[PDB]
Symmetry: C2
Subunit: 316 residues, 2 copies
């Protein structure tokens, strides 16, 4: 059989894209999107209808251009999620404005607003995951949202400190990046080539997976951002893995069953005391890679958010 089919025995497959064409081809359980993918998806000709519906809907909600651009931008993200939900049995991950990453209150409000839009379309909370950056503020926002029945996807996770704080906050799911960690080491280290087993991103996720299962945490671990299938195969057994269409294609075209790599067969151990903000900040900043990548990821998603608003703006 093919690799994709083989991987499904050990890991739940998730598609990382806003393009419905991939949902039909690989039939993933869930789908994830982010600001960059939403911007690209808005370029797809067949999605024109979704944009027009968003704009039209926005103009019917208020007569304030400022509010219309925000309403139109949020509605478009939701409209794309709605199309995807028609093709997947699981959940859709929609990300909140990255410009609010360091504002707990604003992030909670934005998250509830997105949930509201999905509910207005008849979609219940169990089919959605609100995506927030894993800053201390985002984690505190997520802890509150989960208590109110809103499940979260904590993304842009790079340091172990972030992984621990997320588990202690009881978030529904974390999406530690693998590929971006590799990118940092390739650009800031002499070693430009890594064997799958020594790939820094793979090592990071493996260690997080162990820590989570070892302590009985229920938070779903979902590896994200891949540079090659080698990273994916090395993480076979991870709860879930969200993969770009290009890599999904490679997996489905390669023959040969694979073996489970990530497993925890021991007994659950007692959980330590909760990490405080000071300890979190100290530990996170001890990681040069994590420091650079978290801030960078937030900057890029913010820029793409702005580019989308610009685009929507020229349509009002």
């Amino acid at each position: 059989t093919d690799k994709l089919t083989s991987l499904r025995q050990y890991t739940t497959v998730v598609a990382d894209t806003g393009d419905i064409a991939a949902m039909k081809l690989y039939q993933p359980q869930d789908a994830t999107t982010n600001p960059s993918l939403i911007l690209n998806a808005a370029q797809i000709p067949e999605y024109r209808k979704l944009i027009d519906d968003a704009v039209a809907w926005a103009k019917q909600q208020s007569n304030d251009r400022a509010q219309q651009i925000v309403d139109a931008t949020d509605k478009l993200a939701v409209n794309i999620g709605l199309e995807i939900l028609k093709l997947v049995p699981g959940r859709i991950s929609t990300e909140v404005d990255a410009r609010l990453s360091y504002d707990t209150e604003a992030s909670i409000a934005k998250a509830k607003r997105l949930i509201k839009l999905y509910n207005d379309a008849g979609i219940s909370n169990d089919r959605i995951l609100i995506k927030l950056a894993s800053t201390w503020q985002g984690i505190r926002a997520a802890e509150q949202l989960e208590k109110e029945g809103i499940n979260c996807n904590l993304t842009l996770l790079f340091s172990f400190a972030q992984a621990r704080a997320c588990a202690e906050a009881g978030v529904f799911l974390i999406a530690p990046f693998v590929g971006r960690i590799l990118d940092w080491y390739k650009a800031n280290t002499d070693k430009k080539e890594y064997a799958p087993a020594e790939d820094p991103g793979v090592v990071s996720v493996s260690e997080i997976y162990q820590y989570y299962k070892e302590h009985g945490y229920e938070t779903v671990v979902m590896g994200a951002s891949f540079r090659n299938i080698g990273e994916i195969l090395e993480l076979a057994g991870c709860d879930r893995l969200t993969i770009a269409p290009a890599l999904l294609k490679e997996l489905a075209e390669s023959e040969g069953a694979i073996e489970r790599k990530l497993s925890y067969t021991g007994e659950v151990k007692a959980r330590p005391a909760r990490i405080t903000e000071s300890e979190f900040l100290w530990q996170h900043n001890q990681d040069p890679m994590a420091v650079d990548k978290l801030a960078e990821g937030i900057r890029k998603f913010a820029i793409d958010q702005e580019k989308l608003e610009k685009m929507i703006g020229d349509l009002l």
Copy 2:
């Protein structure tokens, strides 16, 4: 006349070292130290007496090895400051344990402890500046300390967001780095050579100076960390400049008066509303250089702190 003498007409000269030999040679008004300089100073043979006195004093304060190492390490930093105060009419800057940079409460306690040691030696607060890293937590700590009569030196300042938050907290002085900003651009940009006027560090300090004088802020602006005399001359007119002995030597050996570069001749403008933590975090992290350098500077000072404790440990 020489450059050093000429610079003194426009800028207060400060020596950046823990070596008293330089105080006698250049007769600076103030002196600044940091964890790395304290560690190096501890290697100076004539300073042996200072180390023994610290250890002896520590053992007389308690019989707990853990507390003795901390007491010995803080006392040594204070003893070195005491020797310097005998040679300078101004102030001495002593830095708090960098491991507490993200802990407001712990930083306030450590600062008061150092002040206590200076007071026990008969030195009043007006001869001291407690040095803290410019993280949001350090700034909040400084705001509190200033209200209690303890003047602070906010170091490791890289972003404009940090400069603004410091001014709004009413700190006694800020020490924006110049050389480390240059280092970052040399290592992360194709351009490896900069003319004094285009040196990123110089541009940064100049902009901060303008913003401060333009709004009537009383916080002293002291440029620190230099890579060449060109950076120093380009900042002539800055309130103060703390310079390493090697560069002080170069200035005193070069002939030719210099011209004032930094000046604000307009009228004071109204101050804006205070920046919040969320806005501070957003703006600081928009600066790739600031993100890297702040965390890095804290990591290095923490390591040197540990190396000093190790050294003191083998003497108990």
